Amino acid sequence: FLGDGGDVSFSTRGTQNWTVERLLQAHRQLEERGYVFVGYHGTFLEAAQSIVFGGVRARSQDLDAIWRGFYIAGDPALAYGYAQIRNGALLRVYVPRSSLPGFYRTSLTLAAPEAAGEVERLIGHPLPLRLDAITGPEEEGGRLETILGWPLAERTVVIPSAIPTDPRNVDLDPSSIPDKEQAISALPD
């Protein structure tokens, strides 16, 4: 999914060997196989390492936590809110375009007790999310953050973003987001 070229490597120095060029190619390949970008996921260096080269996996703990899921965000401004004291990495998250019917939206804010009831009505099954995703407001850096049920989360293809992080700003600077990626990043649900 990386395309070709060198070895993508996360560093505080910056994601090694990753160009918006590479981005456009690996995005086009995914689009040709039915995948659609649903937002960003900001995390720290070795966690980025794991996800990209190992895949999104759940944690054999807390199996029944009601709001368990993999969080992402439409605007990297919000995603950017996540990274290590010492500098993280931003990733773009893809799902097959077919699962989009299972993405719901609510105005209540997620992971709060009064949203549980409403969210189960949308999802049509008691939580936690299974192959669903739910978006509701409650970001800060912007409203709107999305939770992916882990079964969906683990079947997404994840790749580095071209938006970089700064060891001085640990919010997000507009000027740093490549305009080519600005284009790639429109949203479905």
Ligand X SMILES: Nc1ncnc2c1ncn2[C@@H]1O[C@H](COP(=O)(O)O)[C@@H](O)[C@H]1O
Site residues, ligand X (CB under 6 A): 43, 47, 50-51, 54, 56-57, 59, 70
Beta-strand ranges (E) seen in the chain are 35-44, 70-72, 88-96, 103-105, 133-136, 145-148, 157-160
Cβ partners under 8 Å of residue 174, min gap 6: none
Chosen from a second copy, ligand NCA, ligand X, none, partner binding at 161 (C-beta under 5 to 8 Å by type): none
Alpha carbon distance 175, 111 (integer Å) = 32
Residue of the chain from 71, 94, 104, 150 that contacts ligand NCA (CB under 6 A): 71
Alpha helix ranges (H) inside 61-167: 76-79, 113-123, 150-153
Alpha helix ranges (H) inside the chain: 20-31, 45-54, 76-79, 113-123, 150-153, 179-184
Q: Which is closer to ligand X, CB of 28 or CB of 86?
A: 86
**Smallest distance from the beta carbon of 48 to a second copy, in angstroms?**
19
Considering only the stretches 37-45, 61-69, 97-105, 173-181, report the one whose residues sit in contact with ligand NCA under the rule CB under 6 A. Answer: 37-45
Query: One symbol per residue from 83 to 112: x for binding ligand NCA (CB under 6 A), - otherwise; what is it?
Result: ------------------------------
Q: Tokens 């999305």 sit at which residue?
A: 146
Annotated binding site: 41-43, 50, 55-61, 145
3 state DSSP class of 68: coil
32 is catalytic: no
Alpha carbon distance 125, 157 (integer Å) = 26
Q: Which is closer to ligand X, CB of 26 or CB of 79?
A: 79
**Smallest distance from the beta carbon of 168 to a second copy, in angstroms?**
19
Can residue 145 be called a binding residue for ligand NCA (CB under 6 A)?
Answer: yes
**Smallest distance from the beta carbon of 175 to ligand X, in angstroms?**
26
3 state DSSP class of 96: strand
Can residue 82 be called a binding residue for ligand NCA (CB under 6 A)?
Answer: yes
Residues with a catalytic annotation lie at 145
